[PDB]
Write a protein that binds this ligand. Structure first.
Ligand SMILES: *Cc1c(COP(=O)(O)O)cnc(C)c1O
Ligand SMILES: *Cc1c(COP(=O)(O)O)cnc(C)c1O
Lengths: 378, 378
């Protein structure tokens, strides 16, 4: 017996702070939609660069930039001074792993994001898999045993995977890993702004452009000071003249400053709307999605029906190619989606999937238009 | 006997395509000023990301992105398909040097940009100095002898230094290096849009935000195919599943797409205005600057008076600190400048300098206001 949507003003306020969608956007897990305020804040900084000078404009923006660090810090339980800006989540993990001291061994999910594995390998890490259930959810007790008996230099948990909408039990794993005396890094690229990311991790990173609906080309890396000062940044070399802290070294480099102030506005908007309220809505968006897609011929829903996420993935039962379906949906029906290849999670995925990832604004009629379009798809 | 300025409509068209400066901007070598068109083009893409989807918007922008590659390619004598987007010039040299095969030995100017040296070191290069005159200009014949007798895996020429406005004889050095059978990389961060960068180099890189007046957070790297396919990118590892070309690997990663289309508009504007005409104007801006600053007490001009560049640097003769002067000029008189520390060119600079780097729009009255303000400076 299905249930109605809990009506909340939040959904509409969100939709109306953003430009009108052309068709139908179900792809906030890939790239969400900047508010007018975010777009204006970015444009404004670029204009200011042109008036007063680019570096003086950047200096004058330290208030807003610091605000953004702090808002991020509050969402993860770190201090604002532990937080640093990056180009994105891949930049973030590379900065971290390339800086890591001593024995480079880690454990992670089998469903680990492929480009993360790529970076792990490129930085000379030995990578072991953590024990999981049939869905890819970590088994926390078994993981505890495994890590006590067989130690590793760090654990890398993707709290929410790009290819499947399973909420990982982050907090429970973090205390298990700490009991074994092992630090935890968290890939919160999908999770930040979506799951409770206040779980006592040692490092966390994420991306601007996804659930926080900020500009592309920005991410964040946060590292606790105990860990931060053990790190040995690749650039500059460790025997270099100009003395600066580890986090100052990691944040070093040319970047789009405007996009960073854009981001700060965007986290601001998340906090303003209420983290907890937004997350409960996204969880409900997921419920409704899986109810509506429960019965489509040629597609089965992969996630349990009451996982607290907005990510819902569909596997074809008659050998249809999601990349093609995605293309059709865009060109013909203006419906934006993501096709996840095996390369996204090579040691878990056996077959590609179609991923919907709608934000708070989605309606039940919109989920029906998708299901309709999904039926009459070549 | 001084000479008048060659009046050209170019100066004014440029000024009027940009926002009104608040005070006086003499710092295009650090960060220039985006045109209204550039700013609008960037904003437009971000808005489009929000309507049609971020990745579909990026795909739809391939025309403009490819245009920008091509415009860059024409300025350096490469093919558009040799050109790739980066975060900036430091990103560029790191991508290149981290990818370099076999024996890692190079020669460069003693006046090499400090962060370049830092990257060279971090990638395990042995770095030798090329012979130069008193100004830091390379002596081409002596360099030819040195390289024949004592070979090196590549030569890194900064065609125009950040700390001093010496135009390096790039073309003449490139043929000398090729005669010795040695490839040449060029740091054209200051030179692109400023000097003739069509000189037959094997690789060239530059930055969006300087003389081409594009967005921050963007640069370009161009590599000839002979060299490109010998390169072995750090990420992904060389034994990785997904097969793609070297340049495709280097351009991989999250980035601000909007800023890239911004950049394309900006190179467009340079080509539209006429490279050769713009360069001759910048050269004249330099002449006028050095005439006007010829006699200031407590400051001497460093560059010969007829170097074809807009970069003019001042050394204090009564132990004044340029960082302080720069700060005063901004806070009190709204004049934007750059203070170059020793760390910018550690193996050449003995003492800090104040750097002016005005674009085509500068007037002679503006250069007088600076000289005036430079006299009554604490
Ligand atoms: C989006 C994604 C990333 C990649 O981050 P970039 O911002 O593209 O560098 C990382 N991990 C997850 C789980 C992803 O969904
Ligand atoms: C500006 C500058 C750079 C640094 O490039 P980024 O865009 O800041 O990464 C490189 N070399 C020269 C000569 C510089 O002036």
């Amino acid at each position: 017996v299905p249930r109605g949507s809990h009506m909340v003003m939040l959904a509409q306020q969100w939709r109306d702070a953003r430009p009108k969608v052309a068709g139908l956007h179900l792809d906030s897990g890939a790239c969400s939609r900047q508010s007018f305020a975010v777009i204006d804040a970015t444009t404004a900084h670029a204009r200011h660069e042109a008036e007063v000078g680019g570096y003086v404009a950047a200096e004058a923006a330290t208030p807003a930039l610091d605000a953004g660090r702090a808002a991020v810090a509050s969402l993860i339980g770190f201090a604002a001074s532990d937080v640093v800006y990056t180009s994105g989540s891949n930049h973030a993990i590379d900065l971290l792993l390339s800086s890591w001291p001593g024995k480079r061994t880690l454990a992670c999910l089998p469903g680990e994001y492929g480009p993360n594995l790529s970076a792990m390998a490129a930085n000379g890490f030995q990578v072991r898999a953590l024990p999981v259930d049939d869905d890819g959810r970590v088994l926390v007790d078994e993981a505890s045993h495994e890590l006590s008996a067989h130690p590793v230099a760090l654990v890398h948990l993707t709290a929410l995977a790009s290819h499947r909408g399973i909420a990982q039990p982050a907090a429970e794993l973090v205390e298990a890993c700490h009991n074994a005396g092992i630090p935890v890094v968290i890939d919160a690229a999908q999770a930040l702004g979506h799951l409770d990311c206040n779980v006592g991790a040692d490092a966390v990173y994420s991306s601007s452009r996804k659930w926080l609906a900020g500009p592309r080309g920005v991410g964040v890396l946060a590292v606790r000071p105990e860990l931060a000062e053990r790190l040995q940044p690749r650039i500059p070399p460790s025997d270099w003249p100009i003395p600066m802290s580890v986090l100052e070294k990691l944040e070093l480099g040319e970047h789009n400053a405007a996009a960073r102030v854009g981001f700060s506005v965007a986290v601001g908007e998340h906090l303003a709307a209420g983290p907890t309220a937004v997350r409960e809505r996204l969880a409900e968006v997921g419920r409704l999605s899986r109810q509506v897609l429960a019965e489509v011929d040629g597609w089965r829903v992969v996630e349990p029906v009451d996982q607290p996420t907005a990510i819902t993935t569909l596997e074809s039962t008659d050998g249809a190619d999601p990349a093609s379906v995605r293309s059709w949906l865009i060109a013909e029906r203006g419906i934006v989606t993501t096709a996840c290849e095996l390369a996204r999670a090579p040691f878990e995925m056996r077959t590609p999937v179609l991923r919907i990832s709608p934000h708070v604004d989605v309606t039940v009629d919109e989920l029906e238009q998708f299901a309709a379009a999904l039926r009459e798809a070549p």
